[PDB]
């Protein structure tokens, strides 16, 4: 199986193995599953990550400025800032998405996508 680790710049966000990972790279969506070739990919400013945890439910994460890496042992998601699906506030994300600033609007819309709006 994949050893999935999500590493925020300030801390190691989450390091649970999973069967399948999914996210929108700058070149389009990408789905990583065991024994994928090594890869490095910049995620779109509003990318979101789905991790298909084997036992528990799916794990949907909003990510800001993420970089995905694939290696035979692990799948890394390096992150500037991230939030799991449960902690997202829909109104706050909507308010941020209306901002003209690219970074804040991108983060808000990423939070919306992870929330499943």
């Amino acid at each position: 199986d994949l050893n999935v680790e999500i590493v925020a710049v300030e801390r190691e966000l989450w390091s649970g193995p999973a069967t399948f990972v999914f996210t929108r790279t700058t070149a389009g969506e990408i789905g990583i599953l065991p024994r994928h070739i090594p890869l490095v990919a910049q995620l779109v400013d509003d990318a979101m990550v789905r991790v298909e945890r084997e036992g528990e439910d799916d794990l949907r994460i909003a990510v800001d400025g993420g970089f995905l890496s694939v290696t035979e042992e692990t799948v890394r998601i390096l992150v500037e800032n991230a939030q799991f699906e449960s902690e997202i506030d829909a109104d706050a994300a909507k308010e941020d998405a209306a901002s003209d600033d690219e970074r804040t609007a991108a983060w808000g819309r990423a939070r919306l996508r992870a929330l499943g709006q």
């Binding site: 070149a27 890869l39 490095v40 970089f67």
Partner: protein, 43 residues
Amino acid sequence: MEVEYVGEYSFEPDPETLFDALLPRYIATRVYAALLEAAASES
């Protein structure tokens, strides 16, 4: 930065643009490490 060479993958959308976009992040994370370590030394 000096480019370091030592004795002994795929990329999207190409290696050059990704490298250019990543170097600022490397600068930011090294400055972050410097600030964290300065806070520790200050304490």
